[PDB]
């Protein structure tokens with residue numbers, strides 16, 4: 001894919017049979033998904049943004065398909081305004097920024 | 100250039116006569132800079148991120164050079180933890196996400 005930025009770079013993702021929308025986000029170190037149920041034991045964490053910090057549950061080794069491409073890695077779950085794919089997963093996609 | 104996402108995509112910018120480091124942020128609609136003065140009038144604006152909303156100052160049609168490219172547009176100034184370059188300016192560079 002080549003994704004221009006006139007619109008939000010929202011892609012379709014597949015999380016265990018659920019399809020969702022998520023923002024491809026180079027400004028995010030990590031992937032944060034809106035509150036949902038994931039497998040495994042989780043570490044509560046603090047994650048900070050524009051408007052301060054929110055608490056998230058960190059889950060490891062979560063299979064996600066982004067854009068038809070399979071990735072497996074860490075996903076943070078909490079009160080985010082939108083699902084965001086962070087660099088930890090965009091590197092698995094092999095995303096680069098180009099200009 | 101082709102920018103990798105192994106590291107934060109930080110670039111040097113020049114705005115208001117000042118050199119700054121900023122994060123190239125495809126998940127950011129708008130460009131948001133830590134508190135500084137600009138030689139233009141502004142209006143208040145509420146901008147919402149992962150922790151919620153913050154009040155910013157909105158300066159319109161602000162020239163910025165990014166990696167030696169001259170761009171112009173809206174710059175928001177306020178209590179952001181990091182300088183971020185949003186889509187409003189990256190579209191002017193011809194920035195695409197590629198994978």
Ligand SMILES: COc1ccc(S(=O)(=O)N(CC(C)C)C[C@@H](O)[C@H](Cc2ccccc2)NC(=O)O[C@H]2CO[C@H]3O[C@@H]4OCC[C@@H]4[C@H]32)cc1
Pocket residue numbers: 023025026027028029030031032047048049050080081082084086122124125126127128129130131146147148149150180181183185
């Ligand atoms: C270490 O792990 C992390 C740590 C932090 C974050 S983050 O979401 O807070 N963020 C980091 C940055 C502030 C240093 C990534 C950004 O891409 C967020 C991601 C984001 C998007 C939407 C909502 C909340 C967050 N964008 C954002 O806050 O943009 C603001 C400014 O312009 C508007 O575009 C967006 O779209 C409309 C509102 C926002 C506005 C993610 C993973």
